[PDB]
């Protein structure tokens, strides 16, 4: 037919029972929304909700990758500019435009280089959207609570060592110099929690 | 059933969309059900109908009713489709099972009739889901070689 199977006449075609009770979800995903823009949840580019996602958290650093416009950004010509700066600082009796010529050559090339890198990077955005991005559909991996289950596995271990007792328990922090300020008969180092 | 949902297109703009649940059937062994959310009443009716023809199921009537119990749940709705001497079911479920041409089926939704969730939607989707899980006897026999 003339358009997508996941999108009917009035908006996104409502499959699950959540869509029938909440059918704002069909026609509005945000302020970057158009009607052709339903079912493709990502909107155009340079546009609101255009950002691709990686394991659910959106990719907002793209330029920083190819080293265009970043603090860590790749610099094309250094040796030139340093050489020329040295020339300027040394003396005023002789003026070297030879250095400024090597440099302006370098720059003249740099322009085209950069346009190339930018173009290749936009191709990367396209590829990343096709073959990698989940389009914001999977749970965040990037903050510690998302990994809670992992930490649980560790707490469990420290519990089975303790005879399956103290869960989430840790040793009492003692003092800066607990070991040498305490008399014979008192614990000088922090014990296992079950051992208290 | 018909129903009304509010659809917010923007923080000012608000539309009243309506909601249809229906089922197409023919007692000759073929039925199907659909639901839709549309702008007008007629619109949602037509949408629901083509959604119901998209989902059409059929039933092998060589056996005239299920020969074993089918225990299956739609979302939150636990359904039992079992063999009976006659058709026994809630009025609606009953003429849904009549839409398939079942003589000997009998069917129950959610243990006690007062059990949540209960909606007209749920009542329909349940029995259709159940029937869609049913295996014909011939199919079972070939299945074991």
């Amino acid at each position: 037919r003339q358009h997508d199977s996941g999108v009917n006449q009035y908006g996104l075609k409502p499959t699950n029972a959540y869509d029938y009770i909440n059918p704002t979800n069909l026609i509005n995903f945000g302020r970057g929304t158009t009607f052709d823009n339903l079912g493709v949840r990502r909107a155009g580019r340079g546009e609101i909700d255009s950002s691709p996602s990686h394991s659910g958290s959106p990719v907002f650093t793209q330029a920083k990758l190819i080293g265009l416009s970043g603090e860590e950004q790749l610099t094309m010509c250094q040796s030139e500019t340093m050489a020329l700066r040295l020339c300027m600082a040394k003396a005023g009796k002789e003026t070297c435009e030879r250095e400024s010529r090597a440099l302006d050559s370098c720059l003249g090339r740099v322009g085209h280089l950069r346009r190339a890198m930018s173009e290749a990077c936009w191709e990367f955005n396209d590829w990343f959207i096709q073959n990698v991005s989940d389009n914001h559909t999977k749970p965040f991996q990037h903050r510690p609570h998302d990994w809670r289950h992992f930490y649980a596995q560790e707490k469990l271990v420290r519990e089975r060592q303790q005879n399956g007792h103290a869960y989430g328990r840790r040793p009492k922090q003692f003092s800066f110099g607990a070991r040498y300020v305490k008399t014979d008969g008192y614990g000088k180092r922090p014990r296992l929690p079950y051992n208290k | 059933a018909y129903d009304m949902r509010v659809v917010k297109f923007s923080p000012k703009d608000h539309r009243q969309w309506i909601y249809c649940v229906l089922y197409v059937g023919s007692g000759k062994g073929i039925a199907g059900w659909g639901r839709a959310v549309a702008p007008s009443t007629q619109e949602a009716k037509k949408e629901a109908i083509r959604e119901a023809f998209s989902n059409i199921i059929a039933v092998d009537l060589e056996q005239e009713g299920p020969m074993y119990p089918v225990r299956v749940n739609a979302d939150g709705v636990r359904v039992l489709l079992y063999p009976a001497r006659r058709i026994v079911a809630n009025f609606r479920v009953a003429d849904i099972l009549c839409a398939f041409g079942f003589q000997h089926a009998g069917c129950r939704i959610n243990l006690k009739a007062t059990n949540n969730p209960k909606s007209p939607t749920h009542t329909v989707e349940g029995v259709f889901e159940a029937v869609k899980a049913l295996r014909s006897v011939s199919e079972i026999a070939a299945s074991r070689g």
Binding site: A17, Y18, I21, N22 | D75, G76
Partner: peptide, 24 residues
């Protein structure tokens, strides 16, 4: 506690874990 809801709040979301806890 107050025996009623002071706020009228209806979330429409139905996470599959909340509903069928037998399987998740």
């Amino acid at each position: 506690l107050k025996t009623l809801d002071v706020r009228e709040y209806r979330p429409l979301a139905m996470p599959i874990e909340f509903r069928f806890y037998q399987r998740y």
